[PDB]
Symmetry: C3
Subunit: 187 residues, 3 copies
Amino acid sequence: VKIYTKNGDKGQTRIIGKQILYKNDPRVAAYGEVDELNSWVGYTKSLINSHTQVLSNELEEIQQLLFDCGHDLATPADDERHSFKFKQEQPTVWLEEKIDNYTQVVPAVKKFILPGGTQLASALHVARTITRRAERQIVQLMREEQINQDVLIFINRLSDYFFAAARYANYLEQQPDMLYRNSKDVF
Amino acid sequence: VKIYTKNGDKGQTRIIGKQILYKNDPRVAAYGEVDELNSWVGYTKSLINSHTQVLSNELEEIQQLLFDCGHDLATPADDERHSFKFKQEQPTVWLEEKIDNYTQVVPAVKKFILPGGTQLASALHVARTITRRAERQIVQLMREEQINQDVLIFINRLSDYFFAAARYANYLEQQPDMLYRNSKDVF
Amino acid sequence: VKIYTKNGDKGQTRIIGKQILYKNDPRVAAYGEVDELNSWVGYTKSLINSHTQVLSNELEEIQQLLFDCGHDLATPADDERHSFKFKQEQPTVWLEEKIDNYTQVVPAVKKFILPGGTQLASALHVARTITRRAERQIVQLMREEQINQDVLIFINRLSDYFFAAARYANYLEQQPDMLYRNSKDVF
Ligand SMILES: Nc1ncnc2c1ncn2[C@@H]1O[C@H](COP(=O)(O)OP(=O)(O)OP(=O)(O)O)[C@@H](O)[C@H]1O
Ligand SMILES: Nc1ncnc2c1ncn2[C@@H]1O[C@H](COP(=O)(O)OP(=O)(O)OP(=O)(O)O)[C@@H](O)[C@H]1O
Ligand SMILES: Nc1ncnc2c1ncn2[C@@H]1O[C@H](COP(=O)(O)OP(=O)(O)OP(=O)(O)O)[C@@H](O)[C@H]1O
Ligand SMILES: [K+]
Ligand SMILES: [K+]
Ligand SMILES: [K+]
Ligand SMILES: [Mg+2]
Ligand SMILES: [Mg+2]
Ligand SMILES: [Mg+2]
């Protein structure tokens, strides 16, 4: 069992189906960024402590879902042998319910908050911004190729989820958020 | 209060003023990278311990300043209703004074150092390299559109600040820097 | 000794040799991404504990090697005064021996694993994905300019190394890997 094949040593790689692409191809960058986000979520999850245990399982669930998203990003729309498996509806409503809940419980802001606080809150804000980076790359891809737009919907909602969860993480250890001192009332 | 509007679900988003852009637009990537840096700084700050307390407040101040920078990056130069608010002079001199101080106190190198050491030092080196990534994206933007060049000046100086601060973090816990074994005398 | 020269304040910077480039030039992005990876490895190394001590020295060695790689990425192929110093053969075989060893010791999977587990394992998966991001940028560069292809070979192998090491980190604290629930038998 050798995970190193050396077939990518020249800069090309396989996607789902028969096609090979350069590794800097927008498709390969898109699910590559999703994989980096997925790894960061894993890292975020490893920071869970006794105060924040309630967040542990949904972070693991998000990791499962990112694999589902990345599958589809790796799959060309005109591939006869492989289909899109990701449906946005239920995973996205599930995120929305959490955003709603977490928004309700934490103290309300007007203004932008400093992305920080506890180590977990801060990690969740990093997740937020990696998701948004990945989102940009999915959009780059979408502008050149037919994608499963359900993936975009979910990844879009996901960075709102990370924002909500990060505030909730602060709430769980009673760490106050700090406001951006020059913020207008934006929320 | 719903932070999810679903208006970005198709890949376009508002900037400051009336314009909408794709999320992979260089402008949106520029202040997006600044937001990721801002989140990383928050994460860096959450690692502060009893040895490194003296670094806590200026990291928070940097977060405030990154919001100021990102405002301007989000603002088109020809927007009649919105202006640039960021002036580089005082924030940049403030960084320079810190670079000078931290450079003076820590042991002097000739050679490149391994970016690492304590967890905070290492986090500061990550901040250094995220700032430089963000800087590249600001430059990408500048090559297509008129920006506030003060933002570039500050973000440029900021990665030197992170280099200096990271060495200082090592000094604060008396963790020696390690040299790149094949370095020429570069400093 | 001032690390801030202010020469980059306008968005251009020197590479090895006489040439200046914009900071968003693919060459500058390539060794820039390598520097970010290098910093992340430093951060990964700072997480080493009593269970995972055996990983400490090779992470430091990787940092040395990334400087060697970045040197060459910074060096134009037609630069009369500066040469490529990086040879892939021995560093790459060294990675392969570790991949082989670590693959042998850890429990075998069929299926994709969730990138996560212990804090070090998870950090190693982040390293994995930053290496792959950097790899894409090296490929971007290669498609425009002559590079030392040895660097590509090594950086390619390196993300397999990080995958193997991350599983090994889990093994060292007896943290089980979790499987992607919808995985096909991919390994
Ligand atoms: N640098 C990269 N960034 C993002 N995705 C990648 C990268 N390289 C490969 N991939 C994708 O992820 C899968 C696994 O990567 P892997 O390293 O096994 O591919 P490879 O580099 O082509 O092969 P090898 O490393 O064995 O030479 C690939 O089949 C490809 O779809
Ligand atoms: N992926 C992204 N990366 C960087 N910046 C973004 C991204 N998406 C939106 N932005 C910018 O940051 C602001 C907030 O993002 P937000 O998610 O609220 O926007 P949206 O995606 O357009 O809306 P929604 O998520 O409600 O559908 C936006 O108005 C836009 O300027
Ligand atoms: N944003 C960046 N991203 C990646 N690499 C960079 C960046 N800026 C400079 N470099 C490269 O790394 C070296 C060190 O960066 P440094 O900040 O010293 O350069 P500079 O910005 O041109 O100068 P200064 O900061 O003194 O105005 C440079 O000579 C250049 O090759
Ligand atoms: K491989
Ligand atoms: K939103
Ligand atoms: K400098
Ligand atoms: Mg959004
Ligand atoms: Mg600079
Ligand atoms: Mg590979």
